[PDB]
Amino acid sequence: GRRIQGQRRGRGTSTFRAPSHRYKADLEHRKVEDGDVIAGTVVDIEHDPARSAPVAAVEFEDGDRRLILAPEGVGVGDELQVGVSAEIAPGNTLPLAEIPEGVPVCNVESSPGDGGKFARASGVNAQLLTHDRNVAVVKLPSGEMKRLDPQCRATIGVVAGGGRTDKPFVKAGNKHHKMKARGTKWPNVRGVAMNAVDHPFGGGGRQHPGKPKSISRNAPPGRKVGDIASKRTGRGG
Amino acid sequence: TGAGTPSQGKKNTTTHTKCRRCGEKSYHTKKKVCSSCGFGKSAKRRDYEWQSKAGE
């Protein structure tokens, strides 16, 4: 047959790429040597095309102007601190070790110094639960208990733009505008609606996947479609 | 819109031009590669054994 869509993606052609030339910046944490003597002022609030959420422009003491992964409640004029001795306040960044237990955090680093990997989307937040000298236990937005190095930096508060998912797109055209801002081919044609040559579910008079949808983890690309290694399906049970 | 005559009217794009190296009108001005001698692609001259019968 012919390579299915999921395989066309891999090639990374224009159709499947994200509009990077239109993107603003990666909201990574500042790199401070030590001393914490790095504070700045929120100079402006901007819209981030890549995340459909507001982001804050900060002007630091040492003359650095950088965009920041902004939590809810950050406003122009406000002073932000980044470092070990940072004040425990919303919008401030400091290692998990310096953060008190039971405090909502966002833009959490996976490995100290990476700039932040977890809890970055609209309205989400990680919850700092347990402390230690060797490991900080954080509950991620998915509900997973994650063990992290206490030296991993994070921002206090939840990510701005919460509730975005609460309003329906209502019309195709609205979805359209959003997809243009992402690395995604849209709209979506069902496998069962294509010819047998184009997808494992294509062909046959009436539309129907002529086989069970739960596919093995070991299935090769081109065959791995439908319900990937499902532990179960449906709503019952 | 038919693929024939009606679609021939839109053809006013210049692509293949006279090649600086070989003199043939094969220098693709968009790709900057000569389809005849290979100028712009290779220092060596484009050539192939299939350009003639096998035993000749």
């Binding site: 809810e72 309205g123 206090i156 508060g157 509730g163 209502v170 | -």
Partner: protein, 73 residues
């Protein structure tokens, strides 16, 4: 407010859009001063017409249930 949708989309979609935009368009109490002069400038961006305080908040509300939790702890 969902009257711009006409007889299209159904009750629920235009009921939520209505309720959401209803609350979204309301007079919001500014965090800086106390005036009910905060308006939306875009997705998650709010500003007070009185003191000009530009700040971040929910996408449709200037404050989300989660954001209110941050203050406590």
């Amino acid at each position: 407010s969902s009257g711009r949708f006409g007889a299209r989309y159904g009750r629920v979609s235009r009921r939520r859009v209505a309720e959401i935009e209803s609350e979204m368009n309301e007079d919001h109490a500014c965090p800086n001063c106390g005036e009910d002069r905060v308006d939306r400038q875009g997705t998650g961006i709010w500003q007070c017409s009185y003191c000009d305080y530009k700040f971040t908040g929910g996408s449709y509300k200037p404050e989300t249930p989660g954001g209110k939790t941050v203050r406590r702890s």
